[PDB]
RNA sequence: GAAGGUCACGGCGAGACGAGCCGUUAUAGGUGUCAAGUGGAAGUGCAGUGAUGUAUGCAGCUGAGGCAUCCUAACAGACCCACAGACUUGAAC
RNA sequence: GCUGGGUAGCCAAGUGCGGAGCGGAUAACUGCUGAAAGCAUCUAAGUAGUAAGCCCACCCCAAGAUGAGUGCUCUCCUAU
RNA sequence: UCGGAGAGAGGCUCGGUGAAAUAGACAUGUCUGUGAAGAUGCGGACUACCUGCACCUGGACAGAAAGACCCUAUGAAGCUU
RNA sequence: CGGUAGGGGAGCGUUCCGUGUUAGGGAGAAACGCGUGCGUGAGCCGCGUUGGACGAAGCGGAAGCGAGAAUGUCGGCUUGA
RNA sequence: GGCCAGUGAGACGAUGGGGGAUAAGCUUCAUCGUCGAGAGGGAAACAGCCCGGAUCACCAGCUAAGGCCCCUAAAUGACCG
RNA sequence: AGGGUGAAAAGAACCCCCAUCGGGGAGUGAAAUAGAACAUGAAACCGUAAGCUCUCAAGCAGUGGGAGGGGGACCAGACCC
């Protein structure tokens, strides 16, 4: 139900990181796709 | 769970999944290529190909089984006559995906859907 | 551990209705195979720690195998496989590799064999059908219908206990149906007809090899 | 990268060098005074740097086990991993030398120990305390016995168990540690061999 | 750009997502055909005042399954990674 | 909409399979040889039978077993 | 009995917007012992790489409302003779 | 020369007033943040940066004079995410 | 005798008894110890048992209670059972 | 509930990004590390950069001892992280 406590810092950094992980890893992708708009595609 | 089952549902019921694969189905034969989602796409591929199939054989019969599908007789007419000439040599396969660039308000992947 | 034969692998190809000259109806596999059940390497107390001999399975072009992959089995001399299997034995020698495992020749008919194979995969599935778990009551105005109802005790134990059963993944594993009559060795088209039922749909691996009683093993 | 890598090692082998050519570090042997003469290592305890005491340098040794007492033996072995073998002691640190133990499965127990004795571990659910006793382990795992026994009486904690590692005990006679030449093993106590 | 790995691309008897596994010139779809399901279409002929029957016709419609065939999409391509391996002893050409 | 059928999938009421050892040490018990105690006594030396109980064996997992095991094979060029 | 299958709305994943009660500090294991007599924090052992996501609620004497029971106050208020 | 309730003695700071429209101050005050000075402590004392005009002592005086706890109270900002 | 406080819930242990079931970490008195308000060492942890009363500094020394196989300071000391 | 750009609006002509918002040069001014959300600008809370440092650990997070590493444009057995 409630939480007893908080994670107030150094865990909730944590948290975020992988977060912004899930970010870094759709930029990669969207890099990868840019050269691919570069030349042929047929 | 979904073992050797093989319908793409397109999030609807049945009421409206044979609603969109109808209109969809006309729009695109009627203008020739139209720009959609992939999965609204990928979908489409049995009832263009299943209709460019029934319009090689245009009989009484075949074309009340057309035209009980498109809801819009004067596409329907444009096959049967169309059809034969310009897709007499092909066996199969009359419809191509290609596939560009998200939609803007809510990242929903697109794709475009054409006559070969 | 320790296989009373060797065995040899295998692909399931459904379910057949064979009759006998009585008139008994009989359920059964067809088991076909792919170019092989190549040995290909050979394990011994001397050098690796114990005896056993490793089985290849199912032939490829080979663009699709690794270096590491194409370097082990051209070292045997063999045609590019998949599925190298080992077989812990007792008996050690006569299995050189680049032999031939004759299936036809190594099992000779009403034999009972222990198939292997990995099942059909049914996801992530609750306390019902992962553990036969019972459900509780429907009308009588109960919240509860499909749980896992309490889980642990009180404060005494004050935790859950490890290995309680969950809802969790059902299926995708293998497991031994050991004792299976053979049926019939068709000569013709390469294909054992096994009594019964077999882990997975058609197509999957099967490690075919003979009943592992304990009059035939380790005292 | 290159250039900026070479030129990069070339200032950190320089300022390496620099430094070293700043105090020096003798080793053991020695007398009370030299010329260093930095900081006081006199009116202040001693305490060790790196320096002396690394693994290669240690001292090892081999206890053959067979016909003596278990816990006698271990008390020993474990002073000897510990250091307090050695005048040079240091709670914090481990300075102590290695052990090899051979023959374990020979070793002895006075009493009716061989039976009656329960080693006892608990795999962690609510069933599962697995019991059995000195012998029917022995003939199964001998290296255990030797093993437990020594872990018990080593300072459980960080420490414990980085200097666990440096026990090694054996099933058989011959062991493998040749190259290292480890010398026999110095044991204070009379009961420690048994009566026969 | 090593070996290899990760992405992307077509998928799956694998799967909540990751994971796993197959495929990337027989992987999915389509087409052809055949098991199978359902039960004798439409059109026309004939019979009956008519509801209807009846022949053409194990039809017609399906075909999540098997098999065949590159007709369509597997294009385009991206990212990660290498000092032959610190340090000490002892046997060995 | 309501019925009447139903392939694949999933399901059981359907189909297969399973529980096995002249393997080990024991518990109560029954003993053999045998004193202390010239006799007796299953015990103090020694040893044999002897349970769905205990341990191996069956079946699944498993070297994150930091104690990170073992085997086979592949790779170590440069702006790439 | 004794469950099974399927349709929707969620749940799950992606993009957009974006709350809450709670919160001494939290580097927040299991066993038995101890203690204001029922411990993640004290003693001894055992077990245990670091970190997400999905599910589950046994414990944190979980959250919620300065117990509404019980009794106290030379408290309050209704009602009775 | 241990010390709860508790009593007695000795002090430090806070704003404002007398001394004082003092010296000290747009070659940098109040403040604000840092000190390898001092004291038994409350606190004191020098520093050059930010800051941009107020204002130390000493001897005295007066209080809206010292905060971590009030399910305090006002404002800010978290946690759950 | 003047001025001016808190306290008026006590707890355990030894003994002398009462009540109880010569039950209770029970209750009530009488005499004394400790806690309360008392750190430190012994008792694994452990208000109330044993030792001992903490003004402060020292990287000196002697000892009380209790101990000297290892975790963990000191005898794997001695002689007789 | 919600005051304090500057002495003076001198409140930013022109150029660039550019549909706007806003931003950077220019210009004004003692100051624009005074730009209208503008004066001093503490804490919580949110980051960015550098020095060291955690993935066999068990922890009211400190404390005594201190391995190895790093300094401060000021050469210390000193001092700090």
Not at chain 2, 32 to 57: F, Q, W
Not at chain 3, 14 to 27: A, I, N, R
Not at chain 3, 194 to 199: Q, S
Not at chain 4, 54 to 62: C, G, M, N, S
Request: with cysteine; proline share 5%; aromatic share 6%.
């Amino acid at each position: 139900a409630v939480p007893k406590k908080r994670t107030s810092i150094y865990k909730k950094r944590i948290r975020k990181n992988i977060w912004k992980k899930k970010g870094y890893w759709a930029a990669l992708k969207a890099f990868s796709l840019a050269k691919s708009l570069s030349t042929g595609n047929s | 769970m979904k073992h050797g089952r093989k319908i793409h549902r397109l999030s609807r019921p049945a009421d409206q999944r044979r609603a969109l694969l109808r209109g969809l189905t006309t729009q695109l034969l009627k203008h020739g290529r139209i720009k959609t989602t992939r999965a609204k796409a990928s979908a489409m591929r049995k009832y263009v190909d299943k209709m460019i199939t029934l319009a090689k054989e245009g009989s009484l019969h075949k074309r009340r089984q057309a035209l009980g599908f498109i809801y819009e007789k004067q596409i329907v007419h444009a096959l049967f006559a169309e059809v034969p000439e310009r897709y007499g040599d092909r066996n199969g396969g009359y419809t191509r995906i290609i596939r560009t660039l998200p939609r803007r308000g809510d990242n929903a992947p697109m794709a475009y859907i054409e006559l070969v | 551990s320790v296989d009373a034969g060797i065995g040899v692998m295998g692909t399931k190809l459904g379910m057949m209705s064979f009759f006998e000259e009585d008139g008994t109806v009989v359920p059964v596999t067809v088991i076909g195979f792919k170019e092989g059940n190549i040995v290909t390497q050979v394990k011994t107390e001397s050098t690796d720690g114990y005896n056993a001999v490793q089985v290849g399975y199912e032939r490829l072009r080979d663009r699709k195998l690794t270096m590491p992959e194409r370097g082990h089995l051209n070292k045997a001399g063999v045609i590019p496989m998949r599925h190298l299997q080992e077989f812990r034995l007792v008996s050690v020698d006569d299995f050189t590799p680049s032999q031939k495992l004759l299936f036809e020749e190594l099992f000779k008919e009403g034999d009972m064999v222990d198939i292997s194979g990995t099942t059909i995969g049914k996801g992530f599935q609750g306390g019902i059908k992962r553990h036969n778990f019972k459900r509780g009551l429907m009308t009588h105005g109960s919240k509860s219908h499909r749980a896992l109802g309490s889980i642990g005790a009180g404060t005494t134990p004050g935790h859950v206990y490890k290995g309680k059963k969950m809802p969790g993944r059902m299926g995708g594993t293998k497991t031994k149906i050991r004792k299976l009559k053979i049926m019939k060795i068709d000569t013709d088209l390469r294909v054992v007809m096994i009594k019964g039922a077999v882990p997975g749909k058609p197509g999957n691996l099967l490690r075919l090899a003979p009943a592992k009683i304990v009059g035939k093993n380790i005292p | 990268t290159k250039c900026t890598e070479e030129w990069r090692q070339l200032k950190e082998a320089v300022k390496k060098e620099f430094a070293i050519p700043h105090v020096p570090l003798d080793q053991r042997w020695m007398f009370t005074l030299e010329e260093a003469t930095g900081p006081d290592i006199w009116n202040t305890t001693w305490y060790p740097k790196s320096a002396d005491h690394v693994p290669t340098d240690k001292k090892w040794y081999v206890v053959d086990a067979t016909d003596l007492i278990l816990g006698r033996m271990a008390s020993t072995i474990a002073i000897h991993i510990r250091g307090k073998n050695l005048a040079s002691y240091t709670p914090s640190v481990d300075m102590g030398a290695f052990v090899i133990v051979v023959n374990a499965d020979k070793v002895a127990v006075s009493g009716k120990k061989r039976t009656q004795k329960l080693y006892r571990r608990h795999s962690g659910r609510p069933g599962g305390l697995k019991e059995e006793t000195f012998d029917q382990l022995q003939k199964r795992i001998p290296e255990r016995i030797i093993e437990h026994a020594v872990r018990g009486m080593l300072p459980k904690g960080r420490l414990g168990r980085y200097l666990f590692n440096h026990l090694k005990v054996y099933k058989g006679a011959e062991h493998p540690h040749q190259a290292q030449q480890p010398i026999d093993l110095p044991l204070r106590d009379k009961r420690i061999r048994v009566e026969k």
